[PDB]
Amino acid sequence: SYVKETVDRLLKGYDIRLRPDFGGPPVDVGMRIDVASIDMVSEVNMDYTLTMYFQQSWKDKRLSYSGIPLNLTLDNRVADQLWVPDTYFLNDKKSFVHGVTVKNRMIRLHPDGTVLYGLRITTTAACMMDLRRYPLDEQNCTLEIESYGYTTDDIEFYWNGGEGAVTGVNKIELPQFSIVDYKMVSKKVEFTTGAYPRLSLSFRLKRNIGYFILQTYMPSTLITILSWVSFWINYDASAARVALGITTVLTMTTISTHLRETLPKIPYVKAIDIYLMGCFVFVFLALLEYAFVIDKWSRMFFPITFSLFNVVYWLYYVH
Amino acid sequence: SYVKETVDRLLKGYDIRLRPDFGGPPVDVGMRIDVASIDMVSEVNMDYTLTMYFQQSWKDKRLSYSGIPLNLTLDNRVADQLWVPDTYFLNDKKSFVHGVTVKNRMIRLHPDGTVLYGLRITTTAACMMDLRRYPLDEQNCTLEIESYGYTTDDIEFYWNGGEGAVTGVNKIELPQFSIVDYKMVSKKVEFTTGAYPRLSLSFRLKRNIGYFILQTYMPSTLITILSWVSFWINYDASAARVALGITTVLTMTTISTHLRETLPKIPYVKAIDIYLMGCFVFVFLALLEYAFVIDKWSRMFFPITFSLFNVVYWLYYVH
Amino acid sequence: TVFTRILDRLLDGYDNRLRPGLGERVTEVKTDIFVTSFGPVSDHDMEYTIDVFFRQSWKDERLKFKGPMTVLRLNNLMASKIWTPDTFFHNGKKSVAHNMTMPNKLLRITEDGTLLYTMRLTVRAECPMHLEDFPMDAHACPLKFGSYAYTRAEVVYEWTREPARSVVVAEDGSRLNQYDLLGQTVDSGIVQSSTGEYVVMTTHFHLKRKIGYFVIQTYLPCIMTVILSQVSFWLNRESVPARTVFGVTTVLTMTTLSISARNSLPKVAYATAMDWFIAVCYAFVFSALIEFATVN
Amino acid sequence: TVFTRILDRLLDGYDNRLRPGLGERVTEVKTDIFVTSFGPVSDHDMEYTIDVFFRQSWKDERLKFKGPMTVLRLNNLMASKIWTPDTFFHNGKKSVAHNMTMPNKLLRITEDGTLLYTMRLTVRAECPMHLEDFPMDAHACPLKFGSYAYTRAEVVYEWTREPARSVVVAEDGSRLNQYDLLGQTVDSGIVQSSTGEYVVMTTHFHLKRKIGYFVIQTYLPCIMTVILSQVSFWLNRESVPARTVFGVTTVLTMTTLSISARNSLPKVAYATAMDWFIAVCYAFVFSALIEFATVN
Amino acid sequence: GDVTVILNNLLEGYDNKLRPDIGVKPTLIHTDMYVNSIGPVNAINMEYTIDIFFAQTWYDRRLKFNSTIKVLRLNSNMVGKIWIPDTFFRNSKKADAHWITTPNRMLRIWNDGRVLYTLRLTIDAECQLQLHNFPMDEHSCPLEFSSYGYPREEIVYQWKRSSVEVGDTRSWRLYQFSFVGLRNTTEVVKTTSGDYVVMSVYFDLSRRMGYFTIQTYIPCTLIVVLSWVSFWINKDAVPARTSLGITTVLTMTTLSTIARKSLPKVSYVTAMDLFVSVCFIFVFSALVEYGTLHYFVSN
Ligand SMILES: *[C@@H]1O[C@H](CO)[C@@H](O[C@@H]2O[C@H](CO)[C@@H](O[C@@H]3O[C@H](CO[C@H]4O[C@H](CO)[C@@H](O)[C@H](O[C@H]5O[C@H](CO)[C@@H](O)[C@H](O)[C@@H]5O)[C@@H]4O)[C@@H](O)[C@H](O[C@H]4O[C@H](CO)[C@@H](O)[C@H](O)[C@@H]4O[C@H]4O[C@H](CO)[C@@H](O)[C@H](O)[C@@H]4O)[C@@H]3O)[C@H](O)[C@H]2NC(C)=O)[C@H](O)[C@H]1NC(C)=O
Ligand SMILES: *[C@@H]1O[C@H](CO)[C@@H](O[C@@H]2O[C@H](CO)[C@@H](O[C@@H]3O[C@H](CO)[C@@H](O)[C@H](O[C@H]4O[C@H](CO)[C@@H](O)[C@H](O)[C@@H]4O)[C@@H]3O)[C@H](O)[C@H]2NC(C)=O)[C@H](O)[C@H]1NC(C)=O
Ligand SMILES: *[C@@H]1O[C@H](CO)[C@@H](O[C@@H]2O[C@H](CO)[C@@H](O[C@@H]3O[C@H](CO)[C@@H](O)[C@H](O)[C@@H]3O)[C@H](O)[C@H]2NC(C)=O)[C@H](O)[C@H]1NC(C)=O
Ligand SMILES: *[C@@H]1O[C@H](CO)[C@@H](O[C@@H]2O[C@H](CO)[C@@H](O[C@@H]3O[C@H](CO)[C@@H](O)[C@H](O)[C@@H]3O)[C@H](O)[C@H]2NC(C)=O)[C@H](O)[C@H]1NC(C)=O
Ligand SMILES: *[C@@H]1O[C@H](CO)[C@@H](O[C@@H]2O[C@H](CO)[C@@H](O)[C@H](O)[C@H]2NC(C)=O)[C@H](O)[C@H]1NC(C)=O
Ligand SMILES: *[C@@H]1O[C@H](CO)[C@@H](O[C@@H]2O[C@H](CO)[C@@H](O)[C@H](O)[C@H]2NC(C)=O)[C@H](O)[C@H]1NC(C)=O
């Protein structure tokens, strides 16, 4: 029953509306990020969804004790009665604290004065994805830790562990992308109001090529089969020849309307559309040689044009 | 004036967390539901949205008063200072109280002590959807009213008014389904913890056949044409007759895409898909055996078996 | 009348922010669940749904009393004052604590010092499904939960009844439409964290895909197409344009059905078994067009 | 230690129901908007999305002091107990106030008595456009804001810096896909209502479409059709019914261009520019096809 | 600091959980609204969204104060410490008030005891199921409210002006249809808990035919002319006329689905599927005549 009087001594006389070590030096805040999972990437809304432990720690004079030897894990509702930093995320769109039983707020106190505050939060952060080249992607999806109402002479940030402040990157299993590297960058960013610390957790996303590369082969094999249908046959039964070239536009249409819901209406550069242009202009070239009718010469010229086409595609892929 | 000090003594000395007759007889609770609308019966998510005027009434000797022969409707800021029963719904997913101007929370008091409580609740309740027979299927989706933390020795539920406790059901209109009957069930459920009362309000939903007969009759003309053109064209250019029946296969594929966008994957097979795929296999095999070998036999075989398939389909449909 | 006078004696001196212990015995909480239902799996974004009752029980020596009756039932209002543990799910990405006229939380204080505290929940947890065999899926969906701030030296979770047998209860109501509940398997573990060491209660749900949902939906059209692939071999040697035009008319539907089968299928870099089934169909197509061009 | 007594001195009888200067001059509100990223523009819902740092400031004579420091960067819990203006957006549809570890509100008192109060908001608003230049139109999305319960004789808005230099795109705050942000234009304005006359700060964002694939993916399948129309009327040395079925594809391409356009714009009553732009391309087809069907 | 004294004198002895006129007065309340926008009628949920400025006015014998202040303006912070009458919308699916940036709650108190109050509300209300004539649309779209707790003997709603008290001044406000007029309606509905007055507000609309003009023209200017050139072509060649006719009905099928794709299915006919089915069965009869002519030319 000794601990209750000490906690009441710590609370009676405390002001939540002041930062610790007030009127003096800036206080440091150490962060730690435990990425649970990249929850949901969305190429429609130019964004992704992340679930992580955001842990942070600092030091104060207002909370110190000497009687209790061990550390003091305390209830989460004392966070409404203790000072915390106003750390936010810049590129977010919709975020929340998980409240499945309570607010997941880890409050741990030390006899020194080291105060620990932990959250399990899910953030839907935007990522400026450049969709110019589709097979290779190499994104840079940032995650901008930044204070809100404290200037750089009032606060400073640091990674608690350097590279060791970020834990759990290798345990991420994404069905659509793959991590190749992650980077933690500190940066001082000024505004009209003032200067602010800004940590950045960035990482690249190499797309898992197998799913879309098995979706890519089907129009190519389809149009090679269509070329071999329209090429080898004699044209006395010309209705057998022309009905092959009739139904090519619906085959192009199915793949185009399937991809049009996946990728948005970005006008700039679409590499899938460049590939489908190399396909459908080749469809028009096959029909052009048909209306020009040399059939065996066009049949031999079709595979070497397909080979130079997907060689151009492969060198566009490997850059 | 005089009424304010009578309300004040009802608020003074009251304990919220203690039920009436705590340690005595079980309290008696009368409930009432007023269905406003059946909003959307989502077959894919297997749920329905219900707007309801939920209403409770009970007895409390602590909340009576001598004079003022009239009823005292109060603000909604007394329900947080009074006891309410913890009545939840079992199979809900998204449910809330509407907060249009305030929280729609009616407290009506009485000089003997009969307390009336009222809420306007929208509930997205899930129900079992057996989709074996698709037309005229009584889905029998229910709403399960149940208390949470009071054993049957502490509470008593009943329908306030008998069978007339559920109103406004005849005033509901749906574009897809139709009310055929509603029923009230008052049972007891034993858990590991204890015994709890349960009210259950059922809804058997006769689906209106007009949208169903439109989305049935629109593809039936296609297989009718598939029979008629196969019976009607001479077999010199036999590929010109067979290729139309193979385009009916992709017509079936478009119908199957509409089906997959309209229905999920279910192990118990439906009643709509089976006759269309059965007549599909028959109209394909008729074209196959017609191209296998003839003009009179095509006129004789296909309409008779077609009408036979029609009448056996109707005889399965009437059940 | 009387019980208000004793609840104030219970609240007198009981700090709402401290667990019993702290230079004393390790706090033990007794954990029980009750699966109300098991919601549908969402294979596109690779998750599932569950809604359960979640029970907890522990002893607080600062809550004993001497009353007329044995146990004492309360509302969620008093339940916000007694210290409860921070039980969170490791796999839940979006969860709701349901409330309707009250928070769905009861508090049953025993005279012995123990208490019961349960809540009705709903968890949208996910499973890392491997997709090497989509009709032959067999998955063990985890439902890990532990403490959030209290160390193994602070609290330890323990199942109430028989763990491997009767600590988890399926209540025979399942709204599933693609899978079926084979069984369940609880587990206990310790996860070494960057903060400290924490107990972990694991529960796996063994699931296999039903056979009449999509398996027949793929099995009927592929058999239809391999039947349509035979008629070109049935064709005459003096009927050479028909054997040519049959193949393109066959593949027009084969492509659309492959698109439809890959439509509801989520994205995976690993190859699926139905991707080899449509490959067998395309190989029959390739053999048919080889036998066509042999005549040509 | 001393600052606790200071802040307790500034609340001895302080009120929040009264603006500074009742029975005195009106209040002066400096206002600044620092946008972060101009988000997506839902043309199907004619609304855009934008992330702002909404700064605003006003002098309050009731809070002067002679303390050791001049400006104290206080917490927003203090700002909840201080008077604030009732600013709101006149055309906002679904605006969110971002909440985190603390709410994204700032407060900086000054020994002069001047304040500073920014809110990191995300506001969406309807941008009512017209489709008279539906391929390559350009619009000015508005953003109107002002007081709700305070008339022009109560509060007065004014931009903080010069109005040319008071709405700032950061460096590259462009979540834009279809459009190109180029400029902006603010102004004041007094709107008479049924209650009174409220001052309104109005801001227009000028934006114009990228030409791009919105022209390419619509004109190149039309380019193939108009090339096939020239190829059909080239010569007649070969068979004539080889040309007629060439019309049939140009039928179904008219299908594919019809579905491809309607999924972006709302169902408007008036015809647009791109609709006639494809209608003339449709009219180029069937006239020549009826002509060839009559003569051949 | 005079108003600080006056308003704090208006706090003690005033319960914020009681209506003022518990006695013989039935507490009549005037009301009005200013329609800011009427959003899209999506018709899939058969609902429409609408933004209004909704305002209420009542009296009190417990808030009369002294002179030298005609009316005092209040922020959104005295609404919780003053009794506010209830108002709830009947057909509201999700009527969420706006809470952004110190929420929109304007309050005024005169010396007489008159209290003005207002809000800023968006509604997604049900309108009707009017699918008799699909081009000839005429929806009324009622909007109605009551007190959820207080009956007609304890609360009375009243307008400010007979049927034209609702201000509405806009031209482009997400209306894909044509708004033609509005009116009010005051009724009393017998409920179970009591009798409550209902203040119905309609919004007369009519669908502009220019939206369905593109949906009607381009199938009509394709299918009918394809059926015409099926007969106008030389019928000596069997793969010309029958092939054109059989691909025309292949094209004509999907446009009926896409024309009914954005809007849900109904039970009764809407005289639009009947409007396209006549031409559909006409091209089908052209197919029947073409198949009849084949039976007597290949002899
Ligand atoms: C099941 O559990 C959930 C989770 O707790 C409950 O949801 C919460 O319910 C409470 C109680 O109704 C809400 O608290 C109240 O919130 C008022 C405004 O808060 C707004 O917060 C943010 C913006 O800051 C919005 O996003 C919110 O909107 C959400 O909720 C609405 C509700 O319908 C939804 O429709 C939306 O879609 C959002 O989801 C909220 O609008 C707040 O003003 C109020 O506080 C006043 O009153 C209390 C008690 O008197 C005191 O704290 C205090 O007096 C406050 O009064 C001050 O301010 C007023 C302003 O007018 C002044 O007049 C006063 O003088 C004084 O200065 C209260 O805190 C909470 O917002 C809500 N949370 C969410 C996420 O929904 C469910 O209700 C619950 N279900 C049950 C019980 O059935
Ligand atoms: C944005 O995030 C902040 C994070 O701090 C959050 O502020 C917190 O809000 C909660 C309520 O939502 C506050 O909790 C209250 O604290 C007071 C203090 O005395 C209590 O009296 C209140 O008790 C009420 O609710 C209890 C719930 O069990 C019941 O006992 C009872 O019904 C009481 O009426 C209540 O617990 C908390 O203090 C703040 N923290 C601050 C301001 O630092 C804010 O709500 C978030 N805004 C959103 C989500 O819009
Ligand atoms: C995503 O893009 C950002 C910027 O476009 C990249 O940030 C940049 O990272 C490099 C490597 O750390 C920084 O270079 C060096 O930074 C240190 C620390 O500040 C500095 O001392 C050196 O002089 C040098 O500049 C660079 O400054 C930084 N730029 C910015 C604007 O922050 C980031 O690395 C990218 N992430 C991925 C995964 O590609
Ligand atoms: C289909 O709907 C019916 C009602 O529309 C429901 O079945 C009801 O189920 C309850 C309990 O599950 C039973 O009611 C019993 O009634 C008897 C006689 O009154 C009573 O003595 C029992 O104590 C019990 O209350 C009964 O099976 C049935 N009741 C009725 C009136 O049909 C349920 O919603 C659905 N049932 C099925 C089988 O799908
Ligand atoms: C209280 O918490 C502190 C902070 O982590 C602990 O101090 C560290 O404990 C780890 C344990 O592996 C050691 O490796 C570090 O060397 C310690 N650092 C310092 C500066 O002491 C401390 O041990 C905890 N105490 C208790 C009783 O749990
Ligand atoms: C207050 O409410 C009670 C509860 O309904 C009313 O008592 C009943 O009123 C109805 C109709 O007014 C009639 O059945 C009887 O007058 C009452 N029946 C019983 C069993 O009490 C009461 O009338 C209401 N008070 C007033 C003034 O109307």
Side-chain angles (χ1 to χ4, degrees), chain A residues 69-71 108 110:
Chain A
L70 74 156
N71 291 321
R108 190 177 71 187
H110 296 85

PDB file of all heavy atoms in Angstrom, chain A residues 69-71 108 110, ligand 5:
ATOM      1  N   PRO A  69      12.219  -0.530  -5.983  1.00  0.00           N
ATOM      2  CA  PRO A  69      13.411  -0.930  -6.743  1.00  0.00           C
ATOM      3  C   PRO A  69      13.119  -1.262  -8.199  1.00  0.00           C
ATOM      4  O   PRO A  69      13.953  -1.009  -9.073  1.00  0.00           O
ATOM      5  CB  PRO A  69      13.910  -2.161  -5.977  1.00  0.00           C
ATOM      6  CG  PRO A  69      12.687  -2.727  -5.343  1.00  0.00           C
ATOM      7  CD  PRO A  69      11.806  -1.555  -5.010  1.00  0.00           C
ATOM      8  N   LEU A  70      11.946  -1.818  -8.475  1.00  0.00           N
ATOM      9  CA  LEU A  70      11.633  -2.293  -9.813  1.00  0.00           C
ATOM     10  C   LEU A  70      10.892  -1.227 -10.613  1.00  0.00           C
ATOM     11  O   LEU A  70      10.413  -0.227 -10.076  1.00  0.00           O
ATOM     12  CB  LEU A  70      10.807  -3.580  -9.759  1.00  0.00           C
ATOM     13  CG  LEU A  70       9.328  -3.542  -9.357  1.00  0.00           C
ATOM     14  CD1 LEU A  70       8.626  -4.754  -9.930  1.00  0.00           C
ATOM     15  CD2 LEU A  70       9.152  -3.533  -7.848  1.00  0.00           C
ATOM     16  N   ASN A  71      10.802  -1.462 -11.921  1.00  0.00           N
ATOM     17  CA  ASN A  71      10.120  -0.534 -12.812  1.00  0.00           C
ATOM     18  C   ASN A  71       8.617  -0.588 -12.584  1.00  0.00           C
ATOM     19  O   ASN A  71       8.087  -1.569 -12.058  1.00  0.00           O
ATOM     20  CB  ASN A  71      10.443  -0.858 -14.266  1.00  0.00           C
ATOM     21  CG  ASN A  71      11.880  -0.566 -14.610  1.00  0.00           C
ATOM     22  OD1 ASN A  71      12.447   0.427 -14.160  1.00  0.00           O
ATOM     23  ND2 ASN A  71      12.485  -1.430 -15.409  1.00  0.00           N
ATOM     24  N   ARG A 108       5.232   2.993 -18.896  1.00  0.00           N
ATOM     25  CA  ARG A 108       6.230   2.404 -18.013  1.00  0.00           C
ATOM     26  C   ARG A 108       7.102   3.512 -17.443  1.00  0.00           C
ATOM     27  O   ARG A 108       7.574   4.385 -18.183  1.00  0.00           O
ATOM     28  CB  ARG A 108       7.079   1.362 -18.742  1.00  0.00           C
ATOM     29  CG  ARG A 108       7.961   0.554 -17.804  1.00  0.00           C
ATOM     30  CD  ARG A 108       8.746  -0.540 -18.519  1.00  0.00           C
ATOM     31  NE  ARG A 108       9.815  -0.014 -19.363  1.00  0.00           N
ATOM     32  CZ  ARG A 108      10.552  -0.759 -20.180  1.00  0.00           C
ATOM     33  NH1 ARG A 108      10.339  -2.065 -20.262  1.00  0.00           N
ATOM     34  NH2 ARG A 108      11.508  -0.202 -20.912  1.00  0.00           N
ATOM     35  N   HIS A 110      10.308   4.662 -14.562  1.00  0.00           N
ATOM     36  CA  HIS A 110      11.593   4.237 -14.038  1.00  0.00           C
ATOM     37  C   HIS A 110      11.926   5.083 -12.820  1.00  0.00           C
ATOM     38  O   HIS A 110      11.442   6.216 -12.704  1.00  0.00           O
ATOM     39  CB  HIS A 110      12.691   4.392 -15.103  1.00  0.00           C
ATOM     40  CG  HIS A 110      12.491   3.519 -16.299  1.00  0.00           C
ATOM     41  ND1 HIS A 110      11.691   3.886 -17.358  1.00  0.00           N
ATOM     42  CD2 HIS A 110      12.988   2.299 -16.607  1.00  0.00           C
ATOM     43  CE1 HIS A 110      11.700   2.927 -18.267  1.00  0.00           C
ATOM     44  NE2 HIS A 110      12.479   1.952 -17.836  1.00  0.00           N
TER      45      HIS A 110
HETATM   46  C1  LIG F   5      13.856  -1.207 -15.779  1.00  0.00           C
HETATM   47  O1  LIG F   5      13.952  -0.773 -17.139  1.00  0.00           O
HETATM   48  C2  LIG F   5      15.280  -0.409 -17.546  1.00  0.00           C
HETATM   49  C3  LIG F   5      15.168   0.112 -18.961  1.00  0.00           C
HETATM   50  O2  LIG F   5      15.177  -0.948 -19.907  1.00  0.00           O
HETATM   51  C4  LIG F   5      16.218  -1.611 -17.411  1.00  0.00           C
HETATM   52  O3  LIG F   5      17.550  -1.193 -17.691  1.00  0.00           O
HETATM   53  C5  LIG F   5      18.162  -2.005 -18.719  1.00  0.00           C
HETATM   54  O4  LIG F   5      17.795  -3.403 -18.631  1.00  0.00           O
HETATM   55  C6  LIG F   5      18.376  -4.221 -19.660  1.00  0.00           C
HETATM   56  C7  LIG F   5      17.830  -5.616 -19.470  1.00  0.00           C
HETATM   57  O5  LIG F   5      18.353  -6.510 -20.442  1.00  0.00           O
HETATM   58  C8  LIG F   5      19.901  -4.160 -19.576  1.00  0.00           C
HETATM   59  O6  LIG F   5      20.457  -4.914 -20.648  1.00  0.00           O
HETATM   60  C9  LIG F   5      20.379  -2.716 -19.650  1.00  0.00           C
HETATM   61  O7  LIG F   5      21.787  -2.660 -19.451  1.00  0.00           O
HETATM   62  C10 LIG F   5      19.681  -1.861 -18.593  1.00  0.00           C
HETATM   63  N1  LIG F   5      20.087  -0.471 -18.708  1.00  0.00           N
HETATM   64  C11 LIG F   5      20.311   0.313 -17.648  1.00  0.00           C
HETATM   65  C12 LIG F   5      20.724   1.721 -17.948  1.00  0.00           C
HETATM   66  O8  LIG F   5      20.184  -0.098 -16.498  1.00  0.00           O
HETATM   67  C13 LIG F   5      16.157  -2.173 -15.994  1.00  0.00           C
HETATM   68  O9  LIG F   5      16.911  -3.377 -15.918  1.00  0.00           O
HETATM   69  C14 LIG F   5      14.714  -2.454 -15.576  1.00  0.00           C
HETATM   70  N2  LIG F   5      14.661  -2.901 -14.194  1.00  0.00           N
HETATM   71  C15 LIG F   5      13.835  -3.863 -13.770  1.00  0.00           C
HETATM   72  C16 LIG F   5      13.910  -4.198 -12.311  1.00  0.00           C
HETATM   73  O10 LIG F   5      13.059  -4.434 -14.529  1.00  0.00           O
END
